[model samples]
Target: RFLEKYVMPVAGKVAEQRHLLAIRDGLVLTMPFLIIGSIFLIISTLPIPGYSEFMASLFGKNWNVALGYPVSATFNIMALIAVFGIAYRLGEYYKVDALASGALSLVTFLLATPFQVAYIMPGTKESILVDGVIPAALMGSQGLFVAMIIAIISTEIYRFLVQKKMIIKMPETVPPAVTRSFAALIPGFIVVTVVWIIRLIFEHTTFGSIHNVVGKLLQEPLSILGASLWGAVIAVILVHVLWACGIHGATIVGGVMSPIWLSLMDQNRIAFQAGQDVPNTITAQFFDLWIYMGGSGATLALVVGMLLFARSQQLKSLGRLSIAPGIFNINEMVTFGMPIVMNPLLLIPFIVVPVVLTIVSYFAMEWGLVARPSGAAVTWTTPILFSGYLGSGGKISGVILQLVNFALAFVIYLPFLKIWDKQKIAEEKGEA
Candidate 1:
């Protein structure tokens, strides 16, 4: 009662914020593009030995280089997509012309990105420069935070103009499409001019571009927060604790965390494609593939326990029904059906299990007992051992670490589960 009264209400409010909700939903919209791009990325560099050589033998040594075309167009332009999507969503929330807002946001994003790139030739002592070249480095995940901020700011300007009735007036017979375009003209031009001036001002500063400024001023700090083990632990705790209070913890926490983890994941992907050691352990995929096995709270182990040892018919039947879904890392039925939510007896283990798995997984990678996630974007519902193997570049150690975490979750849940099972048995027998 105390938790439902206090905690869940707070979570619900956080989930309701327009800007946060827009960012969360907007990022989700870009997943299909990124996931399909990730599929191309995985096929290009499947972790099995000699795959690259075999492909090259068939298609020439430059074959691997061409594989990045889809990746470059998709993952490398994430910030561009993000800016438009964010503005579109926020504009919808503000009751404005979403398409016009998105168009203006995209224009402003391009204006803010640095167009020149410097290249040093391999095996040459001289450096060469190219003008009018849009650096992919500035267009990729590294620029996402800047894109999100600019989207919000640009959309706000558009919203304010619309609210103040600063739009082109047209005859009633002028047609709606033409009127909408004319209405956005002034605001769109103002948005572009403002971004252009800002770009010019930043050019005089040491930061060079808005991307550079945002990176140093904001993105770096957030990267540190999500990259650290302690920061990740705090996030995981908050996730499960909210669930303990009967809230959708992942949606609430994940909205805040998505940007950070996604940035890290992209970094890992870049390094992975180059055949270098992955730079980060905590990624968007890491939680799905490693920590939150069988949905949130690491519930797969509990499902196994129920199937093998549960005394209550409800638990056994639920377990039997849950096993298939559990294999796919989904446990909505297990969460509500086993009544893990709002049940005092199961709360401790439900919250503690994921936290414990998080620490174990973090250190296991830190100590080199397991490989860090390779930042390959697989479906969240990918099964356990395969997810571990594929997500960690096919490392056997990843599989082993998952097995260990599964056992740990089972052991932790066993005692609490036994007590709850006894109570259910007694209640059913009318001896409670």
Candidate 2:
């Protein structure tokens, strides 16, 4: 389904470089920075235990100032790191000249100007995820999205270089040192340029414009349904959207939920300190239900999938290998199983889960039943119930709701797994 929407412009090309041969090589080109930046971004958003007061002082007497500003500031940095990877990858894919690819990758990051806009107004006081005006007011994520171009450029350089030397063997052939270094450097150069420009842009923008806009728009209304029912419905829908995205609702939620979390948590007076317990009240009330609380949903559905769909022991083995990660919010099992591979099933859960969860949690929060994601972006893979622990403003209610969400995922998983199993079996039997 994803492919249907975006076709790979260059699919059948063979790589010419010797160095770009290993799985780790490509990852080295990107994942480390992405993960590290992600970690920083996470830490920045989290409630710093002791420093909350000092941090809050900067933002005002909110008591969560220091914690908020640094993290909010880091988010802009993280966005830069993310975009550096995006631009380089895009250049690689388009088969641009290696040096030129790297150059363009850097340029793309500059053009989008992710850091300039993302940081000016700190999202520390409130959830930055839902602030549409905030993301729109500035350049937005286009600059940070440079990683795609980087990937494209990097891949092509490897491909074309390999073909030139006739060193390219089928799949596992390792390239020579020279080839590998070139491939690595191709994007590294771009990364440096992109990073520099992002910083340069940051110094010029006045952040106050964004802060004021967010203050106004985000305060509109906490209760969309005029009751908690809307919250419940939205929470449910959010779950479906998250589930559909191969169970990565956390990241999606983490990214989009900044506004809702900020507004609700603020209204509730849920305070967070850097050194204090990372408040999990708000997220707990809503997203915590499935991720940390409910103990069901797509993750549990995965277990049902194992029993229902596994035929050969080998297939089950693969399933088990993938399931372990799902425990931590990784969904490799379902992504590949039921052969969801590029299937329509992929989009549905991504779209549905977050929407439902958000609405439901929204109402619960308004009704004083659940906590909001007030303090920060809780660890994405944190145990399902624990999301509330970190982002919930210390509210146990978040944990309770998380449990409920988990159960829902489990229940939903049962029938779907059964149907999936039957389908896989039929396909194996050549019935399809």
Candidate 3:
């Protein structure tokens, strides 16, 4: 009752905030790129024994690197797109010039970043930098938090300048496009100047640029929190709780958490591409592949129980409709059809199983029982066994881990399923 009264409304309000919604929607625009990048990544670095050698024999030794071009193009520019997307979205909410706002956001982000390329001298182990060259390090995931903040702040400034009518006005004879361009000029100048000043201020500090300042202060701590098991547990619990409240819990939690996870996931991707040990276990892919086997609350097992053991006609029909998408990681039917929303009887297993599996899977990956997600953005809807395998860079062990979690969810859900089914049958008889 307290949750319904206080928690749900508060959570809903938080989710409704324009900034968070903009961030979530903006990041979503990057998903297709991530997925596409992952495909080329998988192709180039397929962990299959001799797969590279076989491809090399056919397409020459540089085949993998050739395929890697698409990865760099798609994956390496995520933050760029995200910055533009976020500002554009926020501007849309303000009825401002979204395209111009997005472009100005990119300008602010670039102006705040330094342009030094880290390099190594010929045949030397020491690192050095070449001036006047933009480093790709801050163009991808590492640059993401900075990108997000700059985009938001710059757009806010742009929106404010426009709202205050501090824009260049054009005559009626001027073209609409020309009018828009002139209007953006004033806001653009102010945004650029503000960001450049911040960059200058930070240059005197140990942090070289605004990017480093943000990375040191904000990104690192948030990344640490996102990487920890306890942090993941909190997100998973919150997700399930919101789902039980009939809210899309993952969306609300993910709007914030996904940034950190996406950033970490990119770290895994870089290491994976370099053939190094994948560094993170709690990435976005980790939850999708390991913990969320059949969507939030891991409801695939519950659907299976409905199909096999449900005596009530309603549950049997739901099971039939749910199993296909359940295989593909969609469980709306199981969640809403079974009416898990506010159903206190079923909520226990619905929430508990995912959290328990989170613990089980976290330690399993930590102890080397299963491979970490290899930074691939395997579509969350990708079916379990296959999704697991692809997400872990083609490890059979990944497929095996999904199997273990699937069984775990099923076992936990079994008794709870029986109780709910019996209760439904009783209701049916009473209605008759």
Candidate 4:
């Protein structure tokens, strides 16, 4: 009752706030592009034996290099896309012109980025260096935080200018389209000028670009926080606690954590591709494949418990209905059907089970019992043991860790499951 009466409302409000909503929706916009890029990445580095050699034999030795186009277009330019997506979403929320806002936001982000990149000439040990070439390194995941900040701030500037009627007005006889463009002109100029000035200021600082400054000051610190065991545990608990309050926990929490986790995952990715040890245990794939198997709260274990131990017909039926989707890491049917949301009886385990799983899984990786995620961005809907195998670079230990977590979740849910079943039975019998 306390949670339902107090916490749920607070959670709901936070989830619906304009900035958070914009961030959530904006990140959602990047999903399809990222997923497609990830698919290409997986194909280029397929785990099948002799896959690379086979592809090379079929499509020439440069086959993998050719396949890198999609990855470069998407993953290497993710923050560029993010600036547009975030500005568009916030623009709509603020009742401004979304397209213009997105365009200006993109420009602002680029203005803040360093145009010149250092490069070494090929084919000679003492070759001359190229100093003014453009580099995509800052435009990718490394620049994500800076992009997000610029998107929000730049959009706010655009909206404020438009809202305050600071835009120039065209003649009444002018076309609506032309008038709209005219209106955006003043605000656009102001936004570009301000961003240009800010870029100049940053040029004089020890940090060369906004990207470097943010990476050093903000992104590195947050990534370090997120890479720790306790940090991961806290994040998992917060995700489930919001779920217990009936929110879509992953989407909400992910809106904030995605950049940090993605940066860490990319670190592991770079290392993994170079045949080095993965640098981080608490990656995005770790949460997807190990911590939240069968969705938030590791509810697959609850579904299994229901199928095996539930006494109430409703519980058993839900178990049967939920088992299939549970395998694929989706649990909406179970969350609502089993009524885990706002049910105090199930809430404890709902929050605790994932935390416990996180602790064990973190240590399991630390102790070398399981491998860290391979920085692969497999679709979240991928099934359990299979996801484990793929996520951890085909390590059997990944499957082992997931299996252990499922069993632990089952054990934690058993007593709670029995109690809930009894209550459902009593209510059905009209004894409540």
Top-TM-score candidate index = 3
lDDT of 1 by residue, 1-432 (tens): 456777777888998898888788777767888788877887887868878789989989898778789889888988888888899999999999998898889888888886778778788867877898888887788987988888998998888988888888978899888888888888888888888888899899989778888899889998998999987899999998787766788878887788888899999998998889998989988789888998877799998999999799888898889989999988989787877887888888998989899999899988988998888777788899998888887778988888999989999999988998899999999997
Candidate lDDT scores, in order, read 0.86, 0.43, 0.86, 0.84
Per-prediction TM-score to the true structure, in the order listed: 0.95, 0.44, 0.96, 0.93
Query: Per-residue lDDT of 1-432 in model 3, one digit per residue for the tens?
Result: 246886788778888899998898888888899888888888887878888789889979888878888888877888888999899999998999998998889877777777777778668788976888667777889887887899899999899999999989799998988888988898899889888887888899998778888999999999999999988999999888888778898878987788899988999998988889999889998888888888777788888888899799889988888889999888887788777878887888889999998998899899998999889888888988888899999888788887889999999999989988888888999962
| C-alpha positional error of residue 327 in candidate 1 after TM-score superposition, expressed in Å | 1.6
TM-score of 4: 0.93
Q: Candidate 2: misplaced stretches above 4 Å? A: 1-271, 274-297, 304-319, 341-358, 422-432
- Candidate 1 segments exceeding 4 Å error: 120-127
Clashes of 1: 0
- TM-score of predicted model 3? 0.96
Please give the clash total of every predicted structure, in order: 0, 134, 0, 0
Q: Quick one: ranking by TM-score, best first?
A: 3, 1, 4, 2
